[PDB]
Design a protein around this nucleic acid. Structure first.
Ligand SMILES: [Mg+2]
Ligand SMILES: [Mg+2]
Ligand SMILES: [Mg+2]
Ligand SMILES: [Mg+2]
Ligand SMILES: [Mg+2]
Ligand SMILES: [Mg+2]
Ligand SMILES: [Mg+2]
Ligand SMILES: [Mg+2]
Ligand SMILES: [Mg+2]
Ligand SMILES: [Mg+2]
Ligand SMILES: [Mg+2]
Ligand SMILES: [Mg+2]
Ligand SMILES: [Mg+2]
Ligand SMILES: [Mg+2]
Ligand SMILES: [Mg+2]
Ligand SMILES: [Mg+2]
Ligand SMILES: [Mg+2]
Ligand SMILES: [Mg+2]
Ligand SMILES: [Mg+2]
Ligand SMILES: [Mg+2]
Ligand SMILES: [Mg+2]
Ligand SMILES: [Mg+2]
Ligand SMILES: [Mg+2]
Ligand SMILES: [Mg+2]
Ligand SMILES: [Mg+2]
Ligand SMILES: [Mg+2]
Ligand SMILES: [Mg+2]
Ligand SMILES: [Mg+2]
Ligand SMILES: [Mg+2]
Ligand SMILES: [Mg+2]
Ligand SMILES: [Mg+2]
Ligand SMILES: [Mg+2]
Ligand SMILES: [Mg+2]
Ligand SMILES: [Mg+2]
Ligand SMILES: [Mg+2]
Ligand SMILES: [Mg+2]
Ligand SMILES: [Mg+2]
Ligand SMILES: [Mg+2]
Ligand SMILES: [Mg+2]
Ligand SMILES: [Mg+2]
Ligand SMILES: [Mg+2]
Ligand SMILES: [Mg+2]
Ligand SMILES: [Mg+2]
Ligand SMILES: [Mg+2]
Ligand SMILES: [Mg+2]
Ligand SMILES: [Mg+2]
Ligand SMILES: [Mg+2]
Ligand SMILES: [Mg+2]
Ligand SMILES: [Mg+2]
Ligand SMILES: [Mg+2]
Ligand SMILES: [Mg+2]
Ligand SMILES: [Mg+2]
Ligand SMILES: [Mg+2]
Ligand SMILES: [Mg+2]
Ligand SMILES: [Mg+2]
Ligand SMILES: [Mg+2]
Ligand SMILES: [Mg+2]
Ligand SMILES: [Mg+2]
Ligand SMILES: [Mg+2]
Ligand SMILES: [Mg+2]
Ligand SMILES: [Mg+2]
Ligand SMILES: [Mg+2]
Ligand SMILES: [Mg+2]
Ligand SMILES: [Mg+2]
Ligand SMILES: [Mg+2]
Ligand SMILES: [Mg+2]
Ligand SMILES: [Mg+2]
Ligand SMILES: [Mg+2]
Ligand SMILES: [Mg+2]
Ligand SMILES: [Mg+2]
Ligand SMILES: [Mg+2]
Ligand SMILES: [Mg+2]
Ligand SMILES: [Mg+2]
Ligand SMILES: [Mg+2]
Ligand SMILES: [Mg+2]
Ligand SMILES: [Mg+2]
Ligand SMILES: [Mg+2]
Ligand SMILES: [Mg+2]
Ligand SMILES: [Mg+2]
Ligand SMILES: [Mg+2]
Ligand SMILES: [Mg+2]
Ligand SMILES: [Mg+2]
Ligand SMILES: [Mg+2]
Ligand SMILES: [Mg+2]
Ligand SMILES: [Mg+2]
Ligand SMILES: [Mg+2]
Ligand SMILES: [Mg+2]
Ligand SMILES: [Mg+2]
Ligand SMILES: [Mg+2]
Ligand SMILES: [Mg+2]
Ligand SMILES: [Mg+2]
Ligand SMILES: [Mg+2]
Ligand SMILES: [Mg+2]
Ligand SMILES: [Mg+2]
Ligand SMILES: [Mg+2]
Ligand SMILES: [Mg+2]
Ligand SMILES: [Mg+2]
Ligand SMILES: [Mg+2]
Ligand SMILES: [Mg+2]
Ligand SMILES: [Mg+2]
Ligand SMILES: [Mg+2]
Ligand SMILES: [Mg+2]
Ligand SMILES: [Mg+2]
Ligand SMILES: [Mg+2]
Ligand SMILES: [Mg+2]
Ligand SMILES: [Mg+2]
Ligand SMILES: [Mg+2]
Ligand SMILES: [Mg+2]
Ligand SMILES: [Mg+2]
Ligand SMILES: [Mg+2]
Ligand SMILES: [Mg+2]
Ligand SMILES: [Mg+2]
Ligand SMILES: [Mg+2]
Ligand SMILES: [Mg+2]
Ligand SMILES: [Mg+2]
Ligand SMILES: [Mg+2]
Ligand SMILES: [Mg+2]
Ligand SMILES: [Mg+2]
Ligand SMILES: [Mg+2]
Ligand SMILES: [Mg+2]
Ligand SMILES: [Mg+2]
Ligand SMILES: [Mg+2]
Ligand SMILES: [Mg+2]
Ligand SMILES: [Mg+2]
Ligand SMILES: [Mg+2]
Ligand SMILES: [Mg+2]
Ligand SMILES: [Mg+2]
Ligand SMILES: [Mg+2]
Ligand SMILES: [Mg+2]
Ligand SMILES: [Mg+2]
Ligand SMILES: [Mg+2]
Ligand SMILES: [Mg+2]
Ligand SMILES: [Mg+2]
Ligand SMILES: [Mg+2]
Ligand SMILES: [Mg+2]
Ligand SMILES: [Mg+2]
Ligand SMILES: [Mg+2]
Ligand SMILES: [Mg+2]
Ligand SMILES: [Mg+2]
Ligand SMILES: [Mg+2]
Ligand SMILES: [Mg+2]
Ligand SMILES: [Mg+2]
Ligand SMILES: [Mg+2]
Ligand SMILES: [Mg+2]
Ligand SMILES: [Mg+2]
Ligand SMILES: [Mg+2]
Ligand SMILES: [Mg+2]
Ligand SMILES: [Mg+2]
Ligand SMILES: [Mg+2]
Ligand SMILES: [Mg+2]
Ligand SMILES: [Mg+2]
Ligand SMILES: [Mg+2]
Ligand SMILES: [Mg+2]
Ligand SMILES: [Mg+2]
Ligand SMILES: [Mg+2]
Ligand SMILES: [Mg+2]
Ligand SMILES: [Mg+2]
Ligand SMILES: [Mg+2]
Ligand SMILES: [Mg+2]
Ligand SMILES: [Mg+2]
Ligand SMILES: [Mg+2]
Ligand SMILES: [Mg+2]
Ligand SMILES: [Mg+2]
Ligand SMILES: [Mg+2]
Ligand SMILES: [Mg+2]
Ligand SMILES: [Mg+2]
Ligand SMILES: [Mg+2]
Ligand SMILES: [Mg+2]
Ligand SMILES: [Mg+2]
Ligand SMILES: [Mg+2]
Ligand SMILES: [Mg+2]
Ligand SMILES: [Mg+2]
Ligand SMILES: [Mg+2]
Ligand SMILES: [Mg+2]
Ligand SMILES: [Mg+2]
Ligand SMILES: [Mg+2]
Ligand SMILES: [Mg+2]
Ligand SMILES: [Mg+2]
Ligand SMILES: [Mg+2]
Ligand SMILES: [Mg+2]
Ligand SMILES: [Mg+2]
Ligand SMILES: [Mg+2]
Ligand SMILES: [Mg+2]
Ligand SMILES: [Mg+2]
Ligand SMILES: [Mg+2]
Ligand SMILES: [Mg+2]
Ligand SMILES: [Mg+2]
Ligand SMILES: [Mg+2]
Ligand SMILES: [Mg+2]
Ligand SMILES: [Mg+2]
Ligand SMILES: [Mg+2]
Ligand SMILES: [Mg+2]
Ligand SMILES: [Mg+2]
Ligand SMILES: [Mg+2]
Ligand SMILES: [Mg+2]
Ligand SMILES: [Mg+2]
Ligand SMILES: [Mg+2]
Ligand SMILES: [Mg+2]
Ligand SMILES: [Mg+2]
Ligand SMILES: [Mg+2]
Ligand SMILES: [Mg+2]
Ligand SMILES: [Mg+2]
Ligand SMILES: [Mg+2]
Ligand SMILES: [Mg+2]
Ligand SMILES: [Mg+2]
Ligand SMILES: [Mg+2]
Ligand SMILES: [Mg+2]
Ligand SMILES: [Mg+2]
Ligand SMILES: [Mg+2]
Ligand SMILES: [Mg+2]
Ligand SMILES: [Mg+2]
Ligand SMILES: [Mg+2]
Ligand SMILES: [Mg+2]
Ligand SMILES: [Mg+2]
Ligand SMILES: [Mg+2]
Ligand SMILES: [Mg+2]
Ligand SMILES: [Mg+2]
Ligand SMILES: [Mg+2]
Ligand SMILES: [Mg+2]
Ligand SMILES: [Mg+2]
Ligand SMILES: [Mg+2]
Ligand SMILES: [Mg+2]
Ligand SMILES: [Mg+2]
Ligand SMILES: [Mg+2]
Ligand SMILES: [Mg+2]
Ligand SMILES: [Mg+2]
Ligand SMILES: [Mg+2]
Ligand SMILES: [Mg+2]
Ligand SMILES: [Mg+2]
Ligand SMILES: [Mg+2]
Ligand SMILES: [Mg+2]
Ligand SMILES: [Mg+2]
Ligand SMILES: [Mg+2]
Ligand SMILES: [Zn+2]
Lengths: 122, 204, 118, 131, 59, 7
RNA sequence: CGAUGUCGGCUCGUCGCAUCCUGGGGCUGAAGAAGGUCCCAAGGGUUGGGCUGUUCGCCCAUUAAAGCGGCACGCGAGCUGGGUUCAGAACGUCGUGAGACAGUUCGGUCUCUAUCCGCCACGGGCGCAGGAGGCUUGAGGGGGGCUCUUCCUAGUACGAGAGGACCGGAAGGGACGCACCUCUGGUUUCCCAGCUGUCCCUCCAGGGGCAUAAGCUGGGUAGCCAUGUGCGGAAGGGAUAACCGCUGAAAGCAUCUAAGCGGGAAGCCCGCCCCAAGAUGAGGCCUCCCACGGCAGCCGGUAAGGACCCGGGAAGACCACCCGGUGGAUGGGCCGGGGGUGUAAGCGCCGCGAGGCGUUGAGCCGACCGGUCCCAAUCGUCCGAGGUCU
RNA sequence: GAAUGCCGGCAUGAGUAACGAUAAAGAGGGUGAGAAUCCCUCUCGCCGUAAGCCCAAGGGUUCCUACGCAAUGGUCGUCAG
């Protein structure tokens, strides 16, 4: 449940640290973004000399949420933060690493690169 | 147009192909036929179904005479299923198989006098910024001198629920003939213990 | 909505309502029979039937439990020594409520008696 | 009729009795059958059980873990057929029935608050001496 | 608000039509099987003190 | 770098 | 002018169509794709932000689209009160001055009680020619009506290439709607535990009040719920719009038309869901009572039935509705289970002690699922047909 | 017959709003024609830098006792300033 104004950690080495969702790229008027949904974001905090810098308007895919996501098998999974991975217009990651676990929902949603770079897929 | 009377018993989930499927459990049969509606005599076609046995001590004479002509023990409720003429003289859950698709009718839970926010999902008022005793009020209800009145059907506060509701196209997940049970995926109107009607769907 | 909720409110907040029940319990267990309004009477039944049943157990844990409501040690003694023994073979139902025929004058309220059973 | 018995009757085909009893505060490894791309796998999830909400067949339990610097909580139905096995890896003694407070604690604060439930540990070791 | 107020005096006919629902229903009363007095059903008889066939209360 | 920063 | 509250916002809509999108078309300087432009179409839809009192507008990020207008520039006995529009104050400017300025600036009392119409809900009465208990037909209303992406067809037709379809077929969404509580997530005013201060019971131990209308804190059943779950828009039939025809004169040719007949829209009718015989045009079917006594009328006693009263209820403001009333499981208790809390008190043992260990998943324990006549629905009363005329 | 006329009487709104701090009550026993409301007892709750006590102002018999309840008391009243 990410929506405009929501801050997210960036789980990659793109240089970003914190992004604030400014749009949920899901149809005409999606209220929320969950795992696997792409957002548009402003970069609110970056480390010096990165691929992205503070003030960039980037796209990112939500890779884990503090709201638990439910699964057709009757189980759920929840994380301790909202994290996302900065991507390009071809849904490819813009960094070389991703940090922390990601939700397996990314695989079925079409983000095979990120899932591979993930240390754990839960 | 097969149909059967039932009582809603409660909800659960079962597992089916490593997938959790929320179900609501309905006790349907057995349902004797007590009167058949014919085009020759009644102008249409239907079966009057009985359901749930009744203590004869509390069945009055005119009803007792009705059951008698049918050859049926006294029953609690009588409901008709329209355009349905079962070959037998008793309808059970076995008229439904798993994977079929049904419409379920029940009486929704009664909320009594419901405000405009619960009944009609109105937005109410602000909760600060000067809002003055209107937090749950409906707002304007009209215009001014033209038309100088309120439309019929204007959404307002009033009784909500305890009405007939049909939810449609529910998958029949399982049927347990030994206990007249019927598992249906999803949500069925009404409280546990209420009277439901299960009919073959009208969705193609 | 009030769907499947147990418990009268009796237009008292939570600590006043518990105190109402405790004071009525003391009065019933003291006099054997008391007059109240019908709604209060109907609520007393459960509250007192539990204290009596605990008195049937008789152990020290029961006494301290019952003391939490009744507070009066002599009263509990009468409950454990005199009242509870006469119910030893009775499975619940230690209290009865019978309605009275005349209402109060000043507020028309319907009255009932609540008594301990024989 | 007894509506409650009818529901328990519906649930009886799916009730499991092979899984070990455990309590909040116990550290646990759940072997869980997942599907990834084509095939299906067994992925272990090991952590402290922070709650067990009971509803007969519909009872569920939450297991919390720190994975690569991120807290992960996972909820499992206790009678889920996707559960291959559950290995008790440690018995912890809690004083609460729900342990959400360990979300705000460091690793050494948790270790100090949830210490080994020596009693039930002895019980496990006394069993398994079944012969 | 802006203080709503009757626009016209209610007519004799109209205020009496309002009151067509105000007649009291007489108290419902059964005879007491002991003393034969008229009393409300399901109450202890206030005349002889009996209910359910036995003496319950002093009159 | 929490948590929002000032700078 | 013995008062028609004046901008904007919010809330709630509803209508028009000169149509923003979606559906159907003709022309194109239409290869395809994507456009342009005109015609038909008002069913549905028509996003979230920054600035500003703003309407408007500009901008950011999206979108199928971010339509324009009416309804007293819709809506202050619905809310707001930022602007404007009293009294205070100041700036620029004008005036000798008092003062003044659709110039600016800071501040600045928006009235508990709805009689009538109207609207949302719910009853009472009478009627529907015997009196009743059931089950129904549906005249006529109302609700609903949205849409995108990806894949297959097929990198095919078209195209130098870039690019890239029609038709047909799958899958997955967004917003909205109805219902629901198994799951996820709330609440859960006393369901359990822990805690501080104080006063008290009874000194220890154990407890009770108060600290909020829960003292505080950690939890939390049923219920009510959404963030959660199911399901819905349809399909289909029919008649049409623009538009395209078949056959065809008048008018030897031609012409969709004058006779006749096709095709053709998210739109119209039906279909789906809900209300519904006060539909006074008051419908239909099944069943029950039965022709009573006394001078289309009266008074009585009754029949079938119903009401009263009572125990209650996921029904409910009252009313109504539904269930039950001893031939009974309706509520209360009690028992069993569930569920919550998380190992009571007492005792024993270890420690100088705070405590710890065992007894012990103990004790307590709302509503949920059941059982059990232990308590209470005692006993009764009053209404209620004899059926108009051709 | 009108002057938002004057004085008085009586209507309507209506058995409606309200009955004046949300500190809170319950039972038993008295009294009496009559009692939720007066007296007594027990239980409960509220104030306690007061919601307790003592002066001053102002008020002017409101103090105490007996006997009463038409009106006054926002209900009742056997009680009371
Ligand atoms: Mg990093
Ligand atoms: Mg840099
Ligand atoms: Mg910066
Ligand atoms: Mg990256
Ligand atoms: Mg990290
Ligand atoms: Mg990997
Ligand atoms: Mg199955
Ligand atoms: Mg029934
Ligand atoms: Mg129902
Ligand atoms: Mg029904
Ligand atoms: Mg209902
Ligand atoms: Mg209700
Ligand atoms: Mg409301
Ligand atoms: Mg709502
Ligand atoms: Mg609702
Ligand atoms: Mg609603
Ligand atoms: Mg709102
Ligand atoms: Mg709100
Ligand atoms: Mg508020
Ligand atoms: Mg105000
Ligand atoms: Mg105000
Ligand atoms: Mg107001
Ligand atoms: Mg307010
Ligand atoms: Mg007006
Ligand atoms: Mg106006
Ligand atoms: Mg008009
Ligand atoms: Mg209703
Ligand atoms: Mg409905
Ligand atoms: Mg489907
Ligand atoms: Mg069965
Ligand atoms: Mg019901
Ligand atoms: Mg509510
Ligand atoms: Mg409420
Ligand atoms: Mg109940
Ligand atoms: Mg109740
Ligand atoms: Mg209570
Ligand atoms: Mg109250
Ligand atoms: Mg009150
Ligand atoms: Mg009170
Ligand atoms: Mg009251
Ligand atoms: Mg309190
Ligand atoms: Mg006492
Ligand atoms: Mg006595
Ligand atoms: Mg009394
Ligand atoms: Mg009382
Ligand atoms: Mg109890
Ligand atoms: Mg009685
Ligand atoms: Mg009475
Ligand atoms: Mg009185
Ligand atoms: Mg009174
Ligand atoms: Mg159940
Ligand atoms: Mg793995
Ligand atoms: Mg850890
Ligand atoms: Mg500790
Ligand atoms: Mg410790
Ligand atoms: Mg231990
Ligand atoms: Mg107002
Ligand atoms: Mg006001
Ligand atoms: Mg007013
Ligand atoms: Mg007038
Ligand atoms: Mg009037
Ligand atoms: Mg008059
Ligand atoms: Mg008159
Ligand atoms: Mg008159
Ligand atoms: Mg009237
Ligand atoms: Mg009235
Ligand atoms: Mg009446
Ligand atoms: Mg004027
Ligand atoms: Mg005037
Ligand atoms: Mg005027
Ligand atoms: Mg006026
Ligand atoms: Mg047009
Ligand atoms: Mg279009
Ligand atoms: Mg088009
Ligand atoms: Mg040309
Ligand atoms: Mg084209
Ligand atoms: Mg075109
Ligand atoms: Mg339209
Ligand atoms: Mg429109
Ligand atoms: Mg703005
Ligand atoms: Mg800002
Ligand atoms: Mg402008
Ligand atoms: Mg487009
Ligand atoms: Mg906008
Ligand atoms: Mg406009
Ligand atoms: Mg105009
Ligand atoms: Mg408009
Ligand atoms: Mg104008
Ligand atoms: Mg203007
Ligand atoms: Mg206006
Ligand atoms: Mg206005
Ligand atoms: Mg106003
Ligand atoms: Mg305004
Ligand atoms: Mg107005
Ligand atoms: Mg108004
Ligand atoms: Mg309003
Ligand atoms: Mg202001
Ligand atoms: Mg202002
Ligand atoms: Mg301005
Ligand atoms: Mg101003
Ligand atoms: Mg100057
Ligand atoms: Mg000058
Ligand atoms: Mg000059
Ligand atoms: Mg000025
Ligand atoms: Mg001016
Ligand atoms: Mg001006
Ligand atoms: Mg200017
Ligand atoms: Mg200025
Ligand atoms: Mg100020
Ligand atoms: Mg009115
Ligand atoms: Mg009002
Ligand atoms: Mg009028
Ligand atoms: Mg009626
Ligand atoms: Mg009849
Ligand atoms: Mg009938
Ligand atoms: Mg019908
Ligand atoms: Mg119709
Ligand atoms: Mg009509
Ligand atoms: Mg229609
Ligand atoms: Mg449509
Ligand atoms: Mg291809
Ligand atoms: Mg190509
Ligand atoms: Mg081809
Ligand atoms: Mg080519
Ligand atoms: Mg297609
Ligand atoms: Mg809509
Ligand atoms: Mg709804
Ligand atoms: Mg529900
Ligand atoms: Mg609901
Ligand atoms: Mg729940
Ligand atoms: Mg539940
Ligand atoms: Mg929960
Ligand atoms: Mg839940
Ligand atoms: Mg709950
Ligand atoms: Mg308690
Ligand atoms: Mg303790
Ligand atoms: Mg201290
Ligand atoms: Mg204490
Ligand atoms: Mg003492
Ligand atoms: Mg002590
Ligand atoms: Mg105290
Ligand atoms: Mg205090
Ligand atoms: Mg207090
Ligand atoms: Mg506080
Ligand atoms: Mg406490
Ligand atoms: Mg709490
Ligand atoms: Mg909670
Ligand atoms: Mg939702
Ligand atoms: Mg859908
Ligand atoms: Mg041609
Ligand atoms: Mg031709
Ligand atoms: Mg020709
Ligand atoms: Mg023609
Ligand atoms: Mg045609
Ligand atoms: Mg053709
Ligand atoms: Mg056609
Ligand atoms: Mg469509
Ligand atoms: Mg109907
Ligand atoms: Mg009729
Ligand atoms: Mg009907
Ligand atoms: Mg008509
Ligand atoms: Mg007529
Ligand atoms: Mg007729
Ligand atoms: Mg009829
Ligand atoms: Mg017919
Ligand atoms: Mg009731
Ligand atoms: Mg009743
Ligand atoms: Mg009622
Ligand atoms: Mg009825
Ligand atoms: Mg009935
Ligand atoms: Mg009955
Ligand atoms: Mg009966
Ligand atoms: Mg009876
Ligand atoms: Mg009966
Ligand atoms: Mg029962
Ligand atoms: Mg029972
Ligand atoms: Mg009850
Ligand atoms: Mg249990
Ligand atoms: Mg348990
Ligand atoms: Mg211990
Ligand atoms: Mg112990
Ligand atoms: Mg020692
Ligand atoms: Mg337990
Ligand atoms: Mg207990
Ligand atoms: Mg139990
Ligand atoms: Mg349940
Ligand atoms: Mg029995
Ligand atoms: Mg009798
Ligand atoms: Mg005169
Ligand atoms: Mg004159
Ligand atoms: Mg005059
Ligand atoms: Mg005047
Ligand atoms: Mg006037
Ligand atoms: Mg004058
Ligand atoms: Mg005058
Ligand atoms: Mg005068
Ligand atoms: Mg006068
Ligand atoms: Mg005079
Ligand atoms: Mg006068
Ligand atoms: Mg007068
Ligand atoms: Mg008057
Ligand atoms: Mg009057
Ligand atoms: Mg009234
Ligand atoms: Mg009254
Ligand atoms: Mg009124
Ligand atoms: Mg008032
Ligand atoms: Mg009132
Ligand atoms: Mg007041
Ligand atoms: Mg008061
Ligand atoms: Mg008062
Ligand atoms: Mg106060
Ligand atoms: Mg207060
Ligand atoms: Mg206080
Ligand atoms: Mg008491
Ligand atoms: Mg009292
Ligand atoms: Mg008293
Ligand atoms: Mg007395
Ligand atoms: Mg009194
Ligand atoms: Mg008294
Ligand atoms: Mg008093
Ligand atoms: Mg006294
Ligand atoms: Mg002090
Ligand atoms: Mg103090
Ligand atoms: Mg004076
Ligand atoms: Mg007096
Ligand atoms: Mg008096
Ligand atoms: Mg008097
Ligand atoms: Mg005198
Ligand atoms: Mg007075
Ligand atoms: Mg008086
Ligand atoms: Mg007064
Ligand atoms: Mg006297
Ligand atoms: Mg005195
Ligand atoms: Zn008698």
């Amino acid at each position: 449940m990410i929506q405009p104004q929501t801050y997210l950690e960036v789980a990659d080495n793109t240089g970003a640290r914190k992004i604030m969702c400014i749009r949920v790229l899901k149809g005409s008027n999606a209220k929320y973004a969950t795992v696997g949904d792409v957002i548009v974001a402003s970069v609110k905090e970056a480390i010096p000399r990165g691929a992205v810098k503070e003030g960039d308007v980037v796209k990112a895919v939500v890779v884990r949420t503090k709201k638990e996501i439910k699964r057709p098998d009757g189980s759920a999974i929840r994380f301790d933060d909202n994290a996302a991975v900065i991507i390009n217009n071809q849904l490819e990651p813009r960094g070389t690493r991703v940090f922390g676990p990601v939700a397996r929902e990314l695989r079925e949603k079409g983000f095979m690169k990120i899932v591979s770079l993930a240390p754990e897929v839960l | 147009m097969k149909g059967i009377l039932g009582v809603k018993v409660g909800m659960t989930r079962i597992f089916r192909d490593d997938r959790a499927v929320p179900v609501t459990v309905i006790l349907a049969g057995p349902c004797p036929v007590v009167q058949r509606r014919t085009p020759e005599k009644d102008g249409y076609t239907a079966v009057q179904l009985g359901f749930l046995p009744q203590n004869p001590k509390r069945v009055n004479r005119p009803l007792k005479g009705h059951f008698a002509k049918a050859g049926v023990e006294p029953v609690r409720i009588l409901r008709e299923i329209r355009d349905f003429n079962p070959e037998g003289d008793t309808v059970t859950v076995e008229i439904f198989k798993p994977g079929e698709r049904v419409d379920v009718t029940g009486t929704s839970k009664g909320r009594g006098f419901a405000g405009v926010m619960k009944r009609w999902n109105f937005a109410g008022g602000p909760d600060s910024h000067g809002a003055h005793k209107i937090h749950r009020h409906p707002g304007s209800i009209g215009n001014r001198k033209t038309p100088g009145r309120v439309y019929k059907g204007k959404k307002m506060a009033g009784h909500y629920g305890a009405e007939r509701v049909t939810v449609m196209n529910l998958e029949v997940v399982d049927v347990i003939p030994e206990e007249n049970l019927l598992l249906v995926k999803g949500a069925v109107p009404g409280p546990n213990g209420g009277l439901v009607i299960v009919r073959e769907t009208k969705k193609a | 909505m009030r769907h499947l909720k147990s418990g009268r409110k009796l237009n008292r907040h939570s600590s006043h309502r518990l105190a109402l029940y405790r004071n009525q319990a003391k009065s019933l267990l003291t006099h054997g029979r008391i007059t109240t309004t019908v709604p209060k009477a109907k609520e007393l039944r459960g509250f007192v039937d539990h204290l009596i049943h605990l008195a049937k157990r008789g152990d020290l844990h029961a006494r301290r439990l019952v003391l939490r409501d009744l507070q009066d040690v002599k009263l509990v003694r009468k409950l454990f020594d005199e009242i509870a023994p006469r119910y030893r073979d009775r499975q619940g139902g230690y209290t009865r409520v019978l309605k009275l025929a005349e209402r109060r004058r000043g507020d028309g309220a319907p009255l009932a008696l609540v008594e301990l059973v024989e | 009729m007894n509506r409650g018995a009818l529901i328990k009757l519906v649930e009886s085909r799916y009730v499991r009795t092979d899984l070990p009893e455990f309590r909040p505060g116990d550290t646990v490894r759940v072997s869980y059958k997942v599907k990834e791309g084509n095939r299906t796998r067994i992925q272990d999830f090991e952590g402290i059980v922070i709650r067990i909400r009971r509803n007969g067949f519909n009872t569920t339990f939450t297991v919390r873990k720190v994975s690569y610097g991120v807290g992960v909580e996972r909820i499992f139905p206790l009678h889920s057929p996707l559960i291959q096995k559950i290995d008790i890896v440690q018995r912890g003694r809690a004083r609460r029935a729900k342990l959400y407070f360990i979300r705000n604690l460091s690793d050494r604060e948790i270790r100090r608050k949830l210490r080994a439930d020596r009693k039930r540990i002895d019980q496990d070791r006394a069993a398994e001496r079944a012969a | 608000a802006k203080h709503p107020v009757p626009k016209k005096k209610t007519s004799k006919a109209r205020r009496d039509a309002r009151r067509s629902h105000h007649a009291l229903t007489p108290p419902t009363l059964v005879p007491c099987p002991e003393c034969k007095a008229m009393k409300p059903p399901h109450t202890v008889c206030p005349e002889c003190g009996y209910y359910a066939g036995r003496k319950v209360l002093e009159v | 770098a929490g948590x929002p920063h000032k700078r």
